[PDB]
Amino acid sequence: DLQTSI
Amino acid sequence: SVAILQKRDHEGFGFVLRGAKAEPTPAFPALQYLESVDVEGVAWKAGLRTGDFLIEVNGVNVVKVGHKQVVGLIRQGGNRLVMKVVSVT
């Protein structure tokens, strides 16, 4: 799982 | 549901995308979703909410697309982003 602030 | 996002150069769209990396019953409508959304950010202004699942980015279908590739797509369009999302809630 990955998270990215955009 | 649709959200058109036009941001200023140095701000974000104001959301955290989360989902499976590229590496029975459907429970998710898509692999990537909004883990959180900045209150009163460009994304929240367009109606996006935590838990929205990303169906389309800038006309492209990303239902089964791994995380990094979706982030790649969201960035290609610079300060402009178009999203079709589905709310599970």
Q: How far is B88 from chain A (nearest CA, A)?
A: 19
Q: How far apart are CA B45 and CA B38, in angstroms?
A: 9
Residue of B nearest to A3 (CA): B18
Q: How far is CA B80 from CA A5, B33, B57, in A?
A: 16, 19, 11
Resolution in A: 1.8
Residue ranges of domains in chain B, CATH in brackets = 1-89 (2.30.42.10)
Q: Report the structure determination method.
A: X-ray
- Within 10 angstroms of residue B24's Cβ, the number of other Cβ atoms is 3
Q: How far apart are CA B7 and CA B21, in angstroms?
A: 26
Q: A 1-6 residues with CB below 8 A of B?
A: 1-6
Of A1, A5, A6, the CB nearest to B20: A1
Residue of A nearest to B81 (CA): A6
Bridge partner list, A2: B19
